[PDB]
Each structure stands twice: as structure tokens, then as C-alpha cells.
């Protein structure tokens, strides 16, 4: 909470982020209000992230290798994420693996079970760049992405998902594979 910077409502960056948030808010597009949007700066994690991104850009089948995704969290977790990035050791049921869950659609992250509100009724949703790369099928046992199986050089997939077909959830298992960029503070009207 020391490397957060509030964005004014009348700026390009605030509008990009908020528009993308409302576009994917579905069910609750008209119940949810935005209180605040803050830029997250973590120069070190960003460098560690860019190095991983270079390795994936050089060798992934799927495109894109990188996606913007939402992570709802508890008020107490906000300082840690801003200081350290996403920490899978805080693992709700780990249905698709013991990793950090990101959602394609904000509708999912903004639910009270993922972003529970605090005493002021404020809900914490992070926007993150995530190196999804080549994803495999998640399942509850997974302490890492699932094995690629025989005849692949790479031992494991980059991430795990609910469903390979149209995936809506990504589970990532490396501290450097997800960079928080913005903290959206929202509430139910
Ligand atoms: O935005 C989130 N922040 N934190 C979470 O733990 C989290 C978890 C999450 O899926 C859990 C789940 C449960 C049943 C079926 C599916 Cl497919 C997925 C989705 C989003 C989030």
C-alpha cells in the first residue's frame, strides 16, 4: 500500500481499466460501482515477469502468451500483493489446482466469495498481466501445472484452466508469472 498511485477519473488509463471491468461484469454490470482505481508498481517483479515472458514468446504454440485477468481478494491481502505479487501459499476450494486463480471475466472475481467486502462495503479486485502461455487441464490434486506427457521436451504446461475448450479460469503456479498492474476498489450500490 506504499507503491499504489490513485488515477483521476478523467484520464485515459482510468477509462481503459474501468471500461474493460464493466464490459466483463455481465450479471452485475448495473449493481457494481467503482470507488477508486490505483496503479501498482513493482519494478523487481515486473523485470522477473518480462524475463519469463521472453522465454514463453520464444517457444509457445498458443497465442497470445499473455492476457489481462482479474483477481478478487480480501482487504487484508491487498498490502501483500502490492509488496510481493500473488502468493499461492494463501490457498475457498482449490478445485483446479493449488495455485493463484485469475478470471477472464470480472463477473467472477467481483463475487463476494472471491472479493469479500470490508466494514465500509469496499471490495478489492486486482487487474494483472498473466503469462497463461500453453495451458493444460486443471484438477484438485495439482501442486503444479499438469505434465505434458511423453514426447514433449517441456515437462509441464504453463498454466491450468477449468476447461481447455473455452477456458474462463487460469491457475498459475509461479510467483513471477502474474504482474498486478491495477487495484480496482468497487462496491454494490
Ligand atoms: O477472482 C478470483 N479471486 N480469487 C479466487 O480464489 C478465485 C477463484 C475462482 O474460481 C473458483 C472456481 C470454483 C468453481 C468452479 C470454477 Cl471454474 C472456479 C475464480 C475467481 C477467483
PDB file of N, CA, C and O in Angstrom, residues 15-88:
ATOM      1  N   UNK A  15     -10.011   5.095 -17.599  1.00  0.00           N
ATOM      2  CA  UNK A  15     -11.134   4.765 -18.518  1.00  0.00           C
ATOM      3  C   UNK A  15     -10.913   3.394 -19.156  1.00  0.00           C
ATOM      4  O   UNK A  15     -11.880   2.603 -19.154  1.00  0.00           O
ATOM      5  N   UNK A  16      -9.722   3.130 -19.711  1.00  0.00           N
ATOM      6  CA  UNK A  16      -9.377   1.799 -20.288  1.00  0.00           C
ATOM      7  C   UNK A  16      -9.782   0.746 -19.241  1.00  0.00           C
ATOM      8  O   UNK A  16     -10.609  -0.117 -19.541  1.00  0.00           O
ATOM      9  N   UNK A  17      -9.253   0.860 -18.027  1.00  0.00           N
ATOM     10  CA  UNK A  17      -9.357  -0.196 -16.982  1.00  0.00           C
ATOM     11  C   UNK A  17     -10.827  -0.411 -16.622  1.00  0.00           C
ATOM     12  O   UNK A  17     -11.269  -1.563 -16.521  1.00  0.00           O
ATOM     13  N   UNK A  18     -11.522   0.684 -16.376  1.00  0.00           N
ATOM     14  CA  UNK A  18     -12.931   0.693 -15.905  1.00  0.00           C
ATOM     15  C   UNK A  18     -13.837   0.121 -16.999  1.00  0.00           C
ATOM     16  O   UNK A  18     -14.710  -0.677 -16.647  1.00  0.00           O
ATOM     17  N   UNK A  19     -13.640   0.526 -18.257  1.00  0.00           N
ATOM     18  CA  UNK A  19     -14.431   0.057 -19.437  1.00  0.00           C
ATOM     19  C   UNK A  19     -14.326  -1.470 -19.531  1.00  0.00           C
ATOM     20  O   UNK A  19     -15.370  -2.121 -19.628  1.00  0.00           O
ATOM     21  N   UNK A  20     -13.105  -2.016 -19.471  1.00  0.00           N
ATOM     22  CA  UNK A  20     -12.802  -3.467 -19.544  1.00  0.00           C
ATOM     23  C   UNK A  20     -13.499  -4.192 -18.384  1.00  0.00           C
ATOM     24  O   UNK A  20     -14.042  -5.296 -18.621  1.00  0.00           O
ATOM     25  N   UNK A  21     -13.503  -3.577 -17.190  1.00  0.00           N
ATOM     26  CA  UNK A  21     -14.156  -4.076 -15.945  1.00  0.00           C
ATOM     27  C   UNK A  21     -15.668  -4.222 -16.177  1.00  0.00           C
ATOM     28  O   UNK A  21     -16.226  -5.305 -15.926  1.00  0.00           O
ATOM     29  N   UNK A  22     -16.324  -3.163 -16.658  1.00  0.00           N
ATOM     30  CA  UNK A  22     -17.795  -3.119 -16.897  1.00  0.00           C
ATOM     31  C   UNK A  22     -18.134  -4.068 -18.060  1.00  0.00           C
ATOM     32  O   UNK A  22     -19.100  -4.831 -17.910  1.00  0.00           O
ATOM     33  N   UNK A  23     -17.349  -4.090 -19.142  1.00  0.00           N
ATOM     34  CA  UNK A  23     -17.580  -4.974 -20.321  1.00  0.00           C
ATOM     35  C   UNK A  23     -17.736  -6.433 -19.874  1.00  0.00           C
ATOM     36  O   UNK A  23     -18.496  -7.141 -20.520  1.00  0.00           O
ATOM     37  N   UNK A  24     -17.038  -6.877 -18.826  1.00  0.00           N
ATOM     38  CA  UNK A  24     -16.958  -8.315 -18.451  1.00  0.00           C
ATOM     39  C   UNK A  24     -17.729  -8.559 -17.149  1.00  0.00           C
ATOM     40  O   UNK A  24     -17.638  -9.691 -16.591  1.00  0.00           O
ATOM     41  N   UNK A  25     -18.503  -7.562 -16.703  1.00  0.00           N
ATOM     42  CA  UNK A  25     -19.175  -7.588 -15.378  1.00  0.00           C
ATOM     43  C   UNK A  25     -20.518  -8.341 -15.491  1.00  0.00           C
ATOM     44  O   UNK A  25     -21.004  -8.835 -14.445  1.00  0.00           O
ATOM     45  N   UNK A  26     -21.068  -8.494 -16.705  1.00  0.00           N
ATOM     46  CA  UNK A  26     -22.198  -9.415 -17.017  1.00  0.00           C
ATOM     47  C   UNK A  26     -23.343  -9.224 -16.014  1.00  0.00           C
ATOM     48  O   UNK A  26     -23.791  -8.045 -15.853  1.00  0.00           O
ATOM     49  N   UNK A  27     -23.793 -10.341 -15.397  1.00  0.00           N
ATOM     50  CA  UNK A  27     -24.822 -10.417 -14.330  1.00  0.00           C
ATOM     51  C   UNK A  27     -24.883  -9.077 -13.582  1.00  0.00           C
ATOM     52  O   UNK A  27     -25.939  -8.463 -13.567  1.00  0.00           O
ATOM     53  N   UNK A  28     -23.758  -8.619 -13.025  1.00  0.00           N
ATOM     54  CA  UNK A  28     -23.713  -7.492 -12.069  1.00  0.00           C
ATOM     55  C   UNK A  28     -23.154  -6.216 -12.713  1.00  0.00           C
ATOM     56  O   UNK A  28     -22.558  -5.450 -11.962  1.00  0.00           O
ATOM     57  N   UNK A  29     -23.389  -5.933 -14.001  1.00  0.00           N
ATOM     58  CA  UNK A  29     -22.858  -4.683 -14.632  1.00  0.00           C
ATOM     59  C   UNK A  29     -23.510  -3.436 -14.006  1.00  0.00           C
ATOM     60  O   UNK A  29     -22.837  -2.376 -13.944  1.00  0.00           O
ATOM     61  N   UNK A  30     -24.758  -3.528 -13.552  1.00  0.00           N
ATOM     62  CA  UNK A  30     -25.556  -2.364 -13.076  1.00  0.00           C
ATOM     63  C   UNK A  30     -25.645  -2.316 -11.537  1.00  0.00           C
ATOM     64  O   UNK A  30     -25.994  -1.232 -11.040  1.00  0.00           O
ATOM     65  N   UNK A  31     -25.313  -3.400 -10.813  1.00  0.00           N
ATOM     66  CA  UNK A  31     -25.234  -3.428  -9.322  1.00  0.00           C
ATOM     67  C   UNK A  31     -23.888  -2.882  -8.792  1.00  0.00           C
ATOM     68  O   UNK A  31     -23.865  -2.443  -7.643  1.00  0.00           O
ATOM     69  N   UNK A  32     -22.795  -2.919  -9.572  1.00  0.00           N
ATOM     70  CA  UNK A  32     -21.404  -2.643  -9.085  1.00  0.00           C
ATOM     71  C   UNK A  32     -20.976  -1.224  -9.490  1.00  0.00           C
ATOM     72  O   UNK A  32     -21.146  -0.847 -10.674  1.00  0.00           O
ATOM     73  N   UNK A  33     -20.420  -0.490  -8.521  1.00  0.00           N
ATOM     74  CA  UNK A  33     -19.837   0.855  -8.674  1.00  0.00           C
ATOM     75  C   UNK A  33     -18.318   0.769  -8.436  1.00  0.00           C
ATOM     76  O   UNK A  33     -17.879  -0.016  -7.562  1.00  0.00           O
ATOM     77  N   UNK A  34     -17.550   1.599  -9.149  1.00  0.00           N
ATOM     78  CA  UNK A  34     -16.085   1.760  -8.926  1.00  0.00           C
ATOM     79  C   UNK A  34     -15.858   2.949  -7.987  1.00  0.00           C
ATOM     80  O   UNK A  34     -16.317   4.063  -8.326  1.00  0.00           O
ATOM     81  N   UNK A  35     -15.129   2.727  -6.889  1.00  0.00           N
ATOM     82  CA  UNK A  35     -14.794   3.741  -5.845  1.00  0.00           C
ATOM     83  C   UNK A  35     -13.507   4.474  -6.215  1.00  0.00           C
ATOM     84  O   UNK A  35     -13.411   5.694  -5.969  1.00  0.00           O
ATOM     85  N   UNK A  36     -12.536   3.734  -6.739  1.00  0.00           N
ATOM     86  CA  UNK A  36     -11.097   4.104  -6.795  1.00  0.00           C
ATOM     87  C   UNK A  36     -10.435   3.126  -7.773  1.00  0.00           C
ATOM     88  O   UNK A  36     -10.851   1.934  -7.823  1.00  0.00           O
ATOM     89  N   UNK A  37      -9.451   3.591  -8.522  1.00  0.00           N
ATOM     90  CA  UNK A  37      -8.515   2.718  -9.285  1.00  0.00           C
ATOM     91  C   UNK A  37      -7.103   3.214  -9.001  1.00  0.00           C
ATOM     92  O   UNK A  37      -6.859   4.435  -9.152  1.00  0.00           O
ATOM     93  N   UNK A  38      -6.220   2.292  -8.601  1.00  0.00           N
ATOM     94  CA  UNK A  38      -4.811   2.598  -8.273  1.00  0.00           C
ATOM     95  C   UNK A  38      -3.911   1.781  -9.202  1.00  0.00           C
ATOM     96  O   UNK A  38      -4.225   0.582  -9.448  1.00  0.00           O
ATOM     97  N   UNK A  39      -2.863   2.436  -9.730  1.00  0.00           N
ATOM     98  CA  UNK A  39      -1.728   1.787 -10.432  1.00  0.00           C
ATOM     99  C   UNK A  39      -0.844   1.096  -9.389  1.00  0.00           C
ATOM    100  O   UNK A  39      -0.562   1.727  -8.342  1.00  0.00           O
ATOM    101  N   UNK A  40      -0.429  -0.144  -9.668  1.00  0.00           N
ATOM    102  CA  UNK A  40       0.531  -0.934  -8.849  1.00  0.00           C
ATOM    103  C   UNK A  40       1.880  -0.877  -9.541  1.00  0.00           C
ATOM    104  O   UNK A  40       1.931  -1.247 -10.717  1.00  0.00           O
ATOM    105  N   UNK A  41       2.934  -0.483  -8.833  1.00  0.00           N
ATOM    106  CA  UNK A  41       4.320  -0.528  -9.341  1.00  0.00           C
ATOM    107  C   UNK A  41       5.123  -1.504  -8.478  1.00  0.00           C
ATOM    108  O   UNK A  41       5.151  -1.341  -7.273  1.00  0.00           O
ATOM    109  N   UNK A  42       5.725  -2.504  -9.112  1.00  0.00           N
ATOM    110  CA  UNK A  42       6.670  -3.477  -8.513  1.00  0.00           C
ATOM    111  C   UNK A  42       7.801  -3.672  -9.520  1.00  0.00           C
ATOM    112  O   UNK A  42       7.760  -4.602 -10.342  1.00  0.00           O
ATOM    113  N   UNK A  43       8.790  -2.750  -9.551  1.00  0.00           N
ATOM    114  CA  UNK A  43       9.822  -2.787 -10.605  1.00  0.00           C
ATOM    115  C   UNK A  43      10.499  -4.163 -10.698  1.00  0.00           C
ATOM    116  O   UNK A  43      10.585  -4.728 -11.769  1.00  0.00           O
ATOM    117  N   UNK A  44      10.876  -4.737  -9.565  1.00  0.00           N
ATOM    118  CA  UNK A  44      11.553  -6.061  -9.498  1.00  0.00           C
ATOM    119  C   UNK A  44      10.663  -7.164 -10.089  1.00  0.00           C
ATOM    120  O   UNK A  44      11.109  -7.871 -11.005  1.00  0.00           O
ATOM    121  N   UNK A  45       9.433  -7.327  -9.609  1.00  0.00           N
ATOM    122  CA  UNK A  45       8.531  -8.390 -10.134  1.00  0.00           C
ATOM    123  C   UNK A  45       8.339  -8.153 -11.628  1.00  0.00           C
ATOM    124  O   UNK A  45       8.425  -9.118 -12.406  1.00  0.00           O
ATOM    125  N   UNK A  46       8.153  -6.895 -12.037  1.00  0.00           N
ATOM    126  CA  UNK A  46       7.953  -6.586 -13.472  1.00  0.00           C
ATOM    127  C   UNK A  46       9.149  -7.113 -14.287  1.00  0.00           C
ATOM    128  O   UNK A  46       8.916  -7.729 -15.344  1.00  0.00           O
ATOM    129  N   UNK A  47      10.387  -6.893 -13.826  1.00  0.00           N
ATOM    130  CA  UNK A  47      11.584  -7.393 -14.549  1.00  0.00           C
ATOM    131  C   UNK A  47      11.555  -8.932 -14.576  1.00  0.00           C
ATOM    132  O   UNK A  47      11.762  -9.522 -15.667  1.00  0.00           O
ATOM    133  N   UNK A  48      11.293  -9.562 -13.425  1.00  0.00           N
ATOM    134  CA  UNK A  48      11.256 -11.045 -13.331  1.00  0.00           C
ATOM    135  C   UNK A  48      10.179 -11.575 -14.292  1.00  0.00           C
ATOM    136  O   UNK A  48      10.459 -12.583 -15.007  1.00  0.00           O
ATOM    137  N   UNK A  49       9.025 -10.896 -14.350  1.00  0.00           N
ATOM    138  CA  UNK A  49       7.888 -11.210 -15.258  1.00  0.00           C
ATOM    139  C   UNK A  49       8.297 -11.113 -16.742  1.00  0.00           C
ATOM    140  O   UNK A  49       7.937 -12.016 -17.544  1.00  0.00           O
ATOM    141  N   UNK A  50       8.998 -10.029 -17.115  1.00  0.00           N
ATOM    142  CA  UNK A  50       9.392  -9.769 -18.519  1.00  0.00           C
ATOM    143  C   UNK A  50      10.343 -10.880 -18.985  1.00  0.00           C
ATOM    144  O   UNK A  50      10.220 -11.311 -20.129  1.00  0.00           O
ATOM    145  N   UNK A  51      11.233 -11.360 -18.122  1.00  0.00           N
ATOM    146  CA  UNK A  51      12.180 -12.461 -18.430  1.00  0.00           C
ATOM    147  C   UNK A  51      11.417 -13.754 -18.700  1.00  0.00           C
ATOM    148  O   UNK A  51      11.777 -14.473 -19.655  1.00  0.00           O
ATOM    149  N   UNK A  52      10.417 -14.070 -17.887  1.00  0.00           N
ATOM    150  CA  UNK A  52       9.558 -15.266 -18.123  1.00  0.00           C
ATOM    151  C   UNK A  52       8.846 -15.084 -19.473  1.00  0.00           C
ATOM    152  O   UNK A  52       8.799 -16.023 -20.297  1.00  0.00           O
ATOM    153  N   UNK A  53       8.320 -13.880 -19.706  1.00  0.00           N
ATOM    154  CA  UNK A  53       7.546 -13.584 -20.930  1.00  0.00           C
ATOM    155  C   UNK A  53       8.403 -13.848 -22.178  1.00  0.00           C
ATOM    156  O   UNK A  53       7.871 -14.436 -23.112  1.00  0.00           O
ATOM    157  N   UNK A  54       9.684 -13.443 -22.157  1.00  0.00           N
ATOM    158  CA  UNK A  54      10.697 -13.646 -23.242  1.00  0.00           C
ATOM    159  C   UNK A  54      10.812 -15.160 -23.509  1.00  0.00           C
ATOM    160  O   UNK A  54      10.677 -15.566 -24.691  1.00  0.00           O
ATOM    161  N   UNK A  55      10.977 -15.990 -22.475  1.00  0.00           N
ATOM    162  CA  UNK A  55      11.094 -17.471 -22.658  1.00  0.00           C
ATOM    163  C   UNK A  55       9.811 -18.003 -23.317  1.00  0.00           C
ATOM    164  O   UNK A  55       9.928 -18.899 -24.152  1.00  0.00           O
ATOM    165  N   UNK A  56       8.631 -17.479 -22.975  1.00  0.00           N
ATOM    166  CA  UNK A  56       7.350 -18.035 -23.490  1.00  0.00           C
ATOM    167  C   UNK A  56       7.145 -17.563 -24.928  1.00  0.00           C
ATOM    168  O   UNK A  56       6.683 -18.375 -25.753  1.00  0.00           O
ATOM    169  N   UNK A  57       7.464 -16.299 -25.209  1.00  0.00           N
ATOM    170  CA  UNK A  57       7.296 -15.721 -26.563  1.00  0.00           C
ATOM    171  C   UNK A  57       8.155 -16.526 -27.542  1.00  0.00           C
ATOM    172  O   UNK A  57       7.740 -16.627 -28.706  1.00  0.00           O
ATOM    173  N   UNK A  58       9.271 -17.108 -27.075  1.00  0.00           N
ATOM    174  CA  UNK A  58      10.253 -17.825 -27.934  1.00  0.00           C
ATOM    175  C   UNK A  58       9.791 -19.243 -28.266  1.00  0.00           C
ATOM    176  O   UNK A  58      10.404 -19.819 -29.161  1.00  0.00           O
ATOM    177  N   UNK A  59       8.781 -19.803 -27.593  1.00  0.00           N
ATOM    178  CA  UNK A  59       8.579 -21.277 -27.631  1.00  0.00           C
ATOM    179  C   UNK A  59       7.114 -21.737 -27.463  1.00  0.00           C
ATOM    180  O   UNK A  59       6.877 -22.939 -27.535  1.00  0.00           O
ATOM    181  N   UNK A  60       6.128 -20.874 -27.268  1.00  0.00           N
ATOM    182  CA  UNK A  60       4.713 -21.290 -27.088  1.00  0.00           C
ATOM    183  C   UNK A  60       4.012 -21.530 -28.420  1.00  0.00           C
ATOM    184  O   UNK A  60       4.147 -20.675 -29.309  1.00  0.00           O
ATOM    185  N   UNK A  61       3.210 -22.605 -28.497  1.00  0.00           N
ATOM    186  CA  UNK A  61       2.223 -22.809 -29.591  1.00  0.00           C
ATOM    187  C   UNK A  61       1.162 -21.711 -29.471  1.00  0.00           C
ATOM    188  O   UNK A  61       1.172 -20.820 -30.349  1.00  0.00           O
ATOM    189  N   UNK A  62       0.349 -21.717 -28.404  1.00  0.00           N
ATOM    190  CA  UNK A  62      -0.879 -20.871 -28.280  1.00  0.00           C
ATOM    191  C   UNK A  62      -0.493 -19.388 -28.336  1.00  0.00           C
ATOM    192  O   UNK A  62       0.685 -19.030 -28.087  1.00  0.00           O
ATOM    193  N   UNK A  63      -1.451 -18.567 -28.760  1.00  0.00           N
ATOM    194  CA  UNK A  63      -1.358 -17.096 -28.762  1.00  0.00           C
ATOM    195  C   UNK A  63      -2.706 -16.569 -28.300  1.00  0.00           C
ATOM    196  O   UNK A  63      -3.737 -17.135 -28.640  1.00  0.00           O
ATOM    197  N   UNK A  64      -2.724 -15.514 -27.457  1.00  0.00           N
ATOM    198  CA  UNK A  64      -1.489 -14.878 -27.001  1.00  0.00           C
ATOM    199  C   UNK A  64      -0.892 -15.681 -25.839  1.00  0.00           C
ATOM    200  O   UNK A  64      -1.509 -16.579 -25.329  1.00  0.00           O
ATOM    201  N   UNK A  65       0.335 -15.351 -25.479  1.00  0.00           N
ATOM    202  CA  UNK A  65       1.072 -15.977 -24.349  1.00  0.00           C
ATOM    203  C   UNK A  65       0.653 -15.270 -23.050  1.00  0.00           C
ATOM    204  O   UNK A  65       0.618 -15.912 -21.991  1.00  0.00           O
ATOM    205  N   UNK A  66       0.269 -14.004 -23.178  1.00  0.00           N
ATOM    206  CA  UNK A  66      -0.048 -13.046 -22.096  1.00  0.00           C
ATOM    207  C   UNK A  66      -1.519 -12.623 -22.207  1.00  0.00           C
ATOM    208  O   UNK A  66      -1.967 -12.347 -23.315  1.00  0.00           O
ATOM    209  N   UNK A  67      -2.217 -12.508 -21.080  1.00  0.00           N
ATOM    210  CA  UNK A  67      -3.610 -12.000 -21.005  1.00  0.00           C
ATOM    211  C   UNK A  67      -3.771 -11.090 -19.794  1.00  0.00           C
ATOM    212  O   UNK A  67      -3.141 -11.390 -18.767  1.00  0.00           O
ATOM    213  N   UNK A  68      -4.642 -10.088 -19.890  1.00  0.00           N
ATOM    214  CA  UNK A  68      -5.129  -9.266 -18.739  1.00  0.00           C
ATOM    215  C   UNK A  68      -6.239 -10.044 -18.020  1.00  0.00           C
ATOM    216  O   UNK A  68      -7.157 -10.461 -18.680  1.00  0.00           O
ATOM    217  N   UNK A  69      -6.111 -10.310 -16.725  1.00  0.00           N
ATOM    218  CA  UNK A  69      -7.094 -11.126 -15.955  1.00  0.00           C
ATOM    219  C   UNK A  69      -7.343 -10.487 -14.585  1.00  0.00           C
ATOM    220  O   UNK A  69      -6.513  -9.631 -14.181  1.00  0.00           O
ATOM    221  N   UNK A  70      -8.460 -10.856 -13.942  1.00  0.00           N
ATOM    222  CA  UNK A  70      -8.953 -10.253 -12.664  1.00  0.00           C
ATOM    223  C   UNK A  70      -8.723 -11.262 -11.535  1.00  0.00           C
ATOM    224  O   UNK A  70      -8.814 -12.484 -11.725  1.00  0.00           O
ATOM    225  N   UNK A  71      -8.324 -10.745 -10.391  1.00  0.00           N
ATOM    226  CA  UNK A  71      -8.202 -11.479  -9.106  1.00  0.00           C
ATOM    227  C   UNK A  71      -8.884 -10.642  -8.018  1.00  0.00           C
ATOM    228  O   UNK A  71      -8.335  -9.587  -7.619  1.00  0.00           O
ATOM    229  N   UNK A  72     -10.063 -11.073  -7.596  1.00  0.00           N
ATOM    230  CA  UNK A  72     -10.683 -10.587  -6.352  1.00  0.00           C
ATOM    231  C   UNK A  72      -9.892 -11.104  -5.150  1.00  0.00           C
ATOM    232  O   UNK A  72      -9.326 -12.230  -5.222  1.00  0.00           O
ATOM    233  N   UNK A  73      -9.840 -10.330  -4.073  1.00  0.00           N
ATOM    234  CA  UNK A  73      -9.154 -10.764  -2.833  1.00  0.00           C
ATOM    235  C   UNK A  73      -9.756 -10.026  -1.630  1.00  0.00           C
ATOM    236  O   UNK A  73     -10.615  -9.114  -1.825  1.00  0.00           O
ATOM    237  N   UNK A  74      -9.322 -10.421  -0.433  1.00  0.00           N
ATOM    238  CA  UNK A  74      -9.738  -9.830   0.850  1.00  0.00           C
ATOM    239  C   UNK A  74      -8.943  -8.546   1.077  1.00  0.00           C
ATOM    240  O   UNK A  74      -7.824  -8.448   0.556  1.00  0.00           O
ATOM    241  N   UNK A  75      -9.506  -7.602   1.829  1.00  0.00           N
ATOM    242  CA  UNK A  75      -8.832  -6.342   2.223  1.00  0.00           C
ATOM    243  C   UNK A  75      -7.446  -6.637   2.800  1.00  0.00           C
ATOM    244  O   UNK A  75      -6.459  -6.034   2.374  1.00  0.00           O
ATOM    245  N   UNK A  76      -7.312  -7.550   3.786  1.00  0.00           N
ATOM    246  CA  UNK A  76      -6.008  -7.807   4.407  1.00  0.00           C
ATOM    247  C   UNK A  76      -4.921  -8.273   3.422  1.00  0.00           C
ATOM    248  O   UNK A  76      -3.775  -8.017   3.679  1.00  0.00           O
ATOM    249  N   UNK A  77      -5.300  -8.913   2.314  1.00  0.00           N
ATOM    250  CA  UNK A  77      -4.366  -9.459   1.306  1.00  0.00           C
ATOM    251  C   UNK A  77      -3.778  -8.341   0.433  1.00  0.00           C
ATOM    252  O   UNK A  77      -2.685  -8.553  -0.118  1.00  0.00           O
ATOM    253  N   UNK A  78      -4.465  -7.208   0.285  1.00  0.00           N
ATOM    254  CA  UNK A  78      -4.023  -6.123  -0.646  1.00  0.00           C
ATOM    255  C   UNK A  78      -2.550  -5.728  -0.393  1.00  0.00           C
ATOM    256  O   UNK A  78      -1.741  -5.761  -1.317  1.00  0.00           O
ATOM    257  N   UNK A  79      -2.117  -5.354   0.831  1.00  0.00           N
ATOM    258  CA  UNK A  79      -0.720  -4.970   1.059  1.00  0.00           C
ATOM    259  C   UNK A  79       0.297  -6.015   0.579  1.00  0.00           C
ATOM    260  O   UNK A  79       1.281  -5.630  -0.045  1.00  0.00           O
ATOM    261  N   UNK A  80       0.049  -7.286   0.861  1.00  0.00           N
ATOM    262  CA  UNK A  80       0.969  -8.396   0.483  1.00  0.00           C
ATOM    263  C   UNK A  80       1.122  -8.419  -1.031  1.00  0.00           C
ATOM    264  O   UNK A  80       2.242  -8.480  -1.499  1.00  0.00           O
ATOM    265  N   UNK A  81       0.025  -8.366  -1.774  1.00  0.00           N
ATOM    266  CA  UNK A  81       0.067  -8.485  -3.258  1.00  0.00           C
ATOM    267  C   UNK A  81       0.888  -7.314  -3.813  1.00  0.00           C
ATOM    268  O   UNK A  81       1.662  -7.533  -4.761  1.00  0.00           O
ATOM    269  N   UNK A  82       0.754  -6.131  -3.221  1.00  0.00           N
ATOM    270  CA  UNK A  82       1.425  -4.895  -3.681  1.00  0.00           C
ATOM    271  C   UNK A  82       2.925  -4.968  -3.395  1.00  0.00           C
ATOM    272  O   UNK A  82       3.703  -4.272  -4.075  1.00  0.00           O
ATOM    273  N   UNK A  83       3.295  -5.737  -2.376  1.00  0.00           N
ATOM    274  CA  UNK A  83       4.673  -5.836  -1.856  1.00  0.00           C
ATOM    275  C   UNK A  83       5.410  -7.010  -2.528  1.00  0.00           C
ATOM    276  O   UNK A  83       6.622  -6.872  -2.771  1.00  0.00           O
ATOM    277  N   UNK A  84       4.714  -8.115  -2.811  1.00  0.00           N
ATOM    278  CA  UNK A  84       5.329  -9.439  -3.103  1.00  0.00           C
ATOM    279  C   UNK A  84       4.788 -10.093  -4.397  1.00  0.00           C
ATOM    280  O   UNK A  84       5.369 -11.131  -4.803  1.00  0.00           O
ATOM    281  N   UNK A  85       3.723  -9.551  -4.995  1.00  0.00           N
ATOM    282  CA  UNK A  85       2.875 -10.221  -6.001  1.00  0.00           C
ATOM    283  C   UNK A  85       1.961 -11.274  -5.388  1.00  0.00           C
ATOM    284  O   UNK A  85       1.824 -11.323  -4.159  1.00  0.00           O
ATOM    285  N   UNK A  86       1.383 -12.125  -6.224  1.00  0.00           N
ATOM    286  CA  UNK A  86       0.392 -13.160  -5.845  1.00  0.00           C
ATOM    287  C   UNK A  86       1.120 -14.348  -5.251  1.00  0.00           C
ATOM    288  O   UNK A  86       2.072 -14.815  -5.870  1.00  0.00           O
ATOM    289  N   UNK A  87       0.648 -14.795  -4.087  1.00  0.00           N
ATOM    290  CA  UNK A  87       1.311 -15.799  -3.231  1.00  0.00           C
ATOM    291  C   UNK A  87       0.351 -16.970  -3.034  1.00  0.00           C
ATOM    292  O   UNK A  87      -0.535 -16.896  -2.122  1.00  0.00           O
ATOM    293  N   UNK A  88       0.557 -18.029  -3.832  1.00  0.00           N
ATOM    294  CA  UNK A  88      -0.266 -19.257  -3.810  1.00  0.00           C
ATOM    295  C   UNK A  88      -0.290 -19.965  -2.438  1.00  0.00           C
ATOM    296  O   UNK A  88      -1.172 -20.801  -2.239  1.00  0.00           O
TER     297      UNK A  88
END
